């Protein structure tokens, strides 16, 4: 019979009636499960041994995708779907969350012989990538409400990811002054939604699937790792004091995350070679956080 290989698969995200086949996929992980109500009615009459278990709900699925950067920048739609406002090829973090509910979309995981798993009512809840000395890759995390098995599906023949972008060394700046001795710049963006369970007595003897959710908060964060370097005795630029507001940018040849004003906290580790670690979050009144997506030649 037909076995199902992960390497022989195709992941298509269905949004607005168009299929976004996300090629250049390094690895994805997903699971499906059901919720049970298992009670044991041991009584003084009969100290029974057999439980009363009924399947009544579908446990929400947690799908994680690892997607390489591409020249056609389809992967920026994950920021677009997660709530960021768009102007050109740059994504803004809005001052306030636009809507109460996230942007919902369906997703297919295609396989050979018309086999498919249909995740519905999905939303992008996490996107983080590490700019480092290895090839950058953004791990997106989406949560589903209802999963199903379907025969025919949506396959993104045209909308697809192009060639992976060549590696380019990261560099973090303050205005235009470079920060020396970078190790690993990791950026994190989240849409911490929550499922609104509305399982009621009208759903008795039926399988319940989560359908609606609301956004608790959105945020942009970055953890920067440096080597503890000082150029002067009693230096003022490079030290361990906190910085309430400072313009920061984690720049690459193909992407640049901008914090117009940042709150930096420093942490020193007395390891083999001393390392300082930053904790960059935008300030209260900071302008929207920028995320530029340069395909080629900026």
């Amino acid at each position: 019979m037909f076995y199902s290989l992960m390497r022989e698969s195709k992941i298509v995200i269905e949004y607005d009636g168009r299929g976004y086949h996300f090629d250049a996929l390094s690895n994805y992980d997903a699971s499906t499960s059901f919720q049970e109500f298992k009670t044991l009615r041991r009584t003084i009459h009969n100290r029974t041994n057999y439980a009363d278990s009924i399947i009544n709900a579908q446990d929400p699925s947690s799908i994680s995708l690892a997607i390489n950067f591409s020249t056609t920048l389809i992967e920026s739609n994950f920021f677009d779907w997660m709530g960021f406002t768009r102007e050109g090829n740059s994504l803004f973090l809005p001052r306030n969350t636009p809507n109460i509910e996230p942007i919902m979309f369906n997703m297919y995981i295609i396989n050979h012989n018309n086999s498919c798993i249909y995740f519905e009512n999905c939303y992008v809840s996490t996107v983080d990538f590490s700019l480092d000395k290895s090839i950058p890759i953004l791990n997106v995390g989406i949560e589903s409400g209802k999963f199903s098995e379907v025969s025919t599906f949506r396959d993104g023949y045209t909308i697809t990811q192009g060639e992976v972008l060549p590696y380019s060394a990261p560099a973090v700046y303050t205005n235009s002054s470079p920060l020396p001795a970078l190790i690993s710049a990791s950026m994190s963006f989240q849409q911490q939604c929550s499922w609104r369970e509305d399982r009621n007595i009208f759903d008795i003897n039926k399988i319940y699937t989560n359908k609606r959710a609301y956004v608790n908060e959105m945020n942009a964060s970055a953890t920067l790792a440096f080597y503890y370097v000082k150029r002067l005795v009693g230096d003022k630029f490079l030290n361990l004091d906190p910085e309430t507001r400072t313009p920061l940018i984690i720049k690459n040849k193909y992407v640049s995350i901008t914090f117009p004003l940042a709150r930096i906290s420093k942490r020193l580790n007395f390891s083999d070679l001393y390392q300082v670690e930053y904790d960059v979050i935008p300030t209260a009144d900071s302008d929207p956080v920028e995320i530029n997506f340069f395909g080629e030649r900026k």
Binding site: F37, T39, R41, I44, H45, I54, N200, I201, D203
Partner: protein
């Protein structure tokens, strides 16, 4: 009438006591003398109190249970219950040929089995007379051949008339509900009635 339970209705295993509280209720005129002596006078009648707690009840089981309870509330009769922990059939035989000599009052009782019963009722077991619906509790036992001497915690409510027959098995408490005035049942989204409990109380 009979309170439904897995013995009467085995098709409903959800019925059946998750926990039963058999309380002792003997009102007494207790007085604490200034010299340290405590004097208590028994005047009001004693009555067993039964607190029954039910496990998760499915809709059909609760439908049967509350149908029976509402029939109780309608026809107004008494509601018999059978505690299963005291259902250890420790006395075989038929008790019709067992005579209890008349003119007996108080805790002690003397009954002649005439060589019919097999099995010894140990202390702590239940006891009930055929005519009166009161339920006693054996506290001590002593037999000399066929004659049995049984001591009961509550004094015999009625003096034996020479025809009352012992009932060592299938003893039912003639109780009355005490939660009737405000008795609500909650239905969960899981589909079960949770926290169903009864506060019964023996009448007479």
């Amino acid at each position: 009438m009979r309170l439904p339970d897995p013995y009467t209705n085995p098709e409903y295993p959800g019925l059946g006591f998750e926990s039963v509280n058999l309380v002792d209720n003997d009102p007494m005129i207790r007085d604490e003398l200034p010299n340290g002596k405590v004097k208590e006078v028994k005047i009001s009648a004693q009555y067993w109190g039964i607190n029954i707690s039910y496990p998760e009840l499915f809709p059909d089981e609760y439908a049967f249970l509350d149908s029976r309870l509402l029939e109780y509330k309608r026809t107004g009769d008494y509601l018999d219950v059978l505690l299963p922990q005291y259902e250890a059939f420790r006395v075989r035989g038929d008790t019709k040929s067992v005579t209890i000599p008349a003119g007996q009052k108080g805790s002690q009782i003397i009954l002649n089995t005439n060589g019919t019963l097999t099995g010894q009722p140990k202390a702590g077991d239940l006891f009930k007379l055929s005519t009166h619906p009161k339920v006693y509790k054996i506290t001590n036992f002593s037999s000399s051949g066929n004659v049995w001497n049984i001591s009961l915690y509550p004094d015999l409510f009625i003096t034996t008339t020479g025809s009352e027959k012992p009932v060592f098995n299938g003893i039912l408490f003639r109780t009355k509900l005490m939660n009737g005035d405000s008795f609500g049942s909650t239905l969960n989204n899981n589909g079960t009635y949770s926290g169903i409990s009864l506060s019964l109380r023996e009448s007479l």
